[PDB]
Amino acid sequence: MSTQSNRNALVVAQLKGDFVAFLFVLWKALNLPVPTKCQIDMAKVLANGDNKKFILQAFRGIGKSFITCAFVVWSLWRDPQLKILIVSASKERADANSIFIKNIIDLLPFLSELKPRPGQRDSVISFDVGPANPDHSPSVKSVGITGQLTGSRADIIIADDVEIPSNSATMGAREKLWTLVQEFAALLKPLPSSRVIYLGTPQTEMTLYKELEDNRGYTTIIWPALYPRTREENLYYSQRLAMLRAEYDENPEALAGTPTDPVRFDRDDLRERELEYGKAGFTLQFMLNPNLSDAEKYPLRLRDAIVAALDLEKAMHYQWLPNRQNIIEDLPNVGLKGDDLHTYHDCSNNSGQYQQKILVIDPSGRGKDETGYAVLYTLNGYIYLMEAGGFRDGYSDKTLELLAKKAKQWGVQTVVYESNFGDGMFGKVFSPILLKHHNCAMEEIRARGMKEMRICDTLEPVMQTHRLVIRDEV
Amino acid sequence: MSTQSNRNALVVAQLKGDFVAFLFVLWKALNLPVPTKCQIDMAKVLANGDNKKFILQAFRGIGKSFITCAFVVWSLWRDPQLKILIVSASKERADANSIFIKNIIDLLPFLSELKPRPGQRDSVISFDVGPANPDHSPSVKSVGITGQLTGSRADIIIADDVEIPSNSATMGAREKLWTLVQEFAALLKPLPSSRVIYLGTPQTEMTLYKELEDNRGYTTIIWPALYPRTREENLYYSQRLAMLRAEYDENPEALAGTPTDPVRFDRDDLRERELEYGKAGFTLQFMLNPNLSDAEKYPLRLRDAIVAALDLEKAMHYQWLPNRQNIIEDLPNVGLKGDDLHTYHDCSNNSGQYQQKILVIDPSGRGKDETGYAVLYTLNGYIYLMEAGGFRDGYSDKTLELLAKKAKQWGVQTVVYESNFGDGMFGKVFSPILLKHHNCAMEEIRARGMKEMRICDTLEPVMQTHRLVIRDEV
């Protein structure tokens, strides 16, 4: 039984965390820690099974340390007779983190508890020093670069409040070899958990903004905000209000302090994917649309190559079809179809086709959503309209498969580049207005309350398509 | 037992040499010869398992004969009922060599000792004459060309003090057929050990300089110097000083005599790979580098092909990125990145990429060292930055595999040619200054004490790449 249970905890962190990690209460004695949805999400994200490198952009006044401690415990307690854990922090701050990890360890049952060799010996700063084997060492990040290089067979690095470590660039550079091509690859094959976990609240457009952006440009992990603490979701009268805790917290303080403390927003910038510095320069071309939702910016020309992207409307929002002049070095948007009048799942393929045909048999890349897959078939070369210029990443998927997060991520990342470096020129008014509100929805981007992102999202498909080798001359 | 031990000695020369080769001392009787690290290295290098043709550039006052004798013994004693051994030498000198080989043979136990048919009979100059079968014949090299041609079923040729044999060109030409395409190939298949071993101290830029250079241009074998005699490493007070033996030896004589006797340096030349005759003509273009370590000599031009080589810094030294204009018949160096500020294993790939992209999507050949393999991945077409112009010799190795000595050897050899024949033009000041000190580190080249070779070593990658067929139009 013991072997099965130990192994169970070993590869199911959530179960281990919910069952064995305790706090010792004064009224109820040793009780189970009541994990929160954000903490549970964070535990899953930090595991050998999933990735290796994780970065959290969290707000302040979230009991993050409670989870970080449970993870670090779980790591050392279930390591394959191996592994050194070190943290980078300017304080005593890293000592506080390991204290909590020790608070977790000390409450474990015998069978899950490895024997303790060292434990804050000499009033440090360290547990399980020397072979035993796993260890956790609290370190100042200000010293290390020294801490990173000096470590012998490092397995995990946790970096507390990474955004508030001054002169981090050298310490960060020291980290690169430890993770990036890389003893990390070699240790991961051995099943060496560890790994790099960074968690902290933002601090302007410093080094961390670069870390978060590079991560978010590729993935959408991870960020929780004041709302993650569900106790705040109930007012003084003990009724759910999703509203007053925020009002009360805004008062007895400041709005500038509330974004600083409970929002994890970066200072010197809005959320928007496209910088306002660029959204201000963007001019449009006003045009009167057809009976359908077509806006013609520049008419089709013979011997010009066009590309079309289509983000169909599942139900809420609109169908968005951009047509982009691909001929020259600078891609211009020459025509857009924007409509929510399509009550029929059914008459769009023909309507879209005449614009695709109008633009020199324009190849089209359709977002494969419920309606998408759909419209795919009707305008397929084989399905109904026999249109031979429908782009597909596979034969099962007659367009852009939206499975796996990455396509949208890099599609947004390439979007940003294309629009900002002025490789792609947008003419549609409603286009740029959607960009105005297509901002951070950590860990991705979306349209804020009461706005649509249909136009922007179908340009995201173009952005993703932009990366593709086949696109390098459709 | 005897069969196993005999066979053991047969294919483990070091073991045979350490266990059975003796000297007979006056105070301790028959004792084992105490092999030295240089002698051990030399024994390994002369074996059927390894090569066939070996050349040693040794200093004088090294007991080389002690090893040469042990090898020649081992050859004849463990030949497959075969093999004639002859040496080329102007003396009685070759007679002295075989005397020592006889001194080794005579001390062997019965089971390792083959029966002696002839043994200095008629006051020669020969042992084991006629079928028996193996034999060793002391010969003057001055006569042979006669000695080489006249031999019947020669198996090994050892050439004593090859650098001091006058009118060797004819004797050398006689040797060519015996080794080079070649009865040697045919005898090696039979398991015929032998083979050609040349050992001697240098004597200016004669025929031997050509032999050593041709060998060193391809391989890095073999050379030991006064320091190989570890007794010299301890002073009068019997304390290790790695310093005074050399001082004492420089005194009671001359510095010109010490390079002549204990250094194995060639007279009419410095160590440098590039001749000073060429290093004097080399002009540079002074430029102010970027925030990074980029020096731009000539800006990128449309429709010009560029090549980039990158030797990453493991820890000590610098990261070196040359960019070479490959368009014309004469390759010019148009830009160099030289930095040791990269504390991050981690931000280099992006920085390098912008220069590669700046130079018309410049393909790059990265040295696969710990950091290399690394930077490889991040700028890989698949790994992180998705750069599609990263040269690789394999799919596992995303650049220049530094395994096996040969790449560096021929890379240096091609370097030398490119720079001297003026096919490659170097503009960087620090480039040519590194060449100034990139000299003989037998059997290769490196940077002498307190100098860097990062810039030169990354040009070596270009030189090796220069040979590659794929390079003949990247």
From Swiss-Prot, chains A, B:
GO terms for molecular function: ATP binding; ATP hydrolysis activity; endonuclease activity; metal ion binding. GO terms for cellular component: viral terminase, large subunit. Mg(2+) 2 binds at residues 362, 418. Residues 342-427 are annotated as: Nuclease activity. GO terms for biological process: chromosome organization; viral DNA genome packaging. Its cofactor is Mg(2+). A motif (Walker A motif) lies at residues 58-65. Keywords: ATP-binding, Endonuclease, Hydrolase, Magnesium, Metal-binding, Nuclease, Nucleotide-binding, Viral genome packaging, Viral release from host cell. Its EC number is 3.6.4.-, 3.1.21.-. Homopentamer. Interacts with the terminase small subunit; the active complex is probably heterooligomeric. Interacts with the portal protein. The terminase large subunit acts as an ATP driven molecular motor necessary for viral DNA translocation into empty capsids and as an endonuclease that cuts the viral genome from the concetamer to initiate and to end a packaging reaction. The terminase lies at a unique vertex of the procapsid and is composed of two subunits, a small terminase subunit involved in viral DNA recognition (packaging sequence), and a large terminase subunit possessing endonucleolytic and ATPase activities. Both terminase subunits heterooligomerize and are docked on the portal protein to form the packaging machine. Belongs to the Teseptimavirus large terminase family. This is Terminase, large subunit. It comes from Escherichia phage T7. The chain holds residues 1 to 476 of 586 of the full protein.
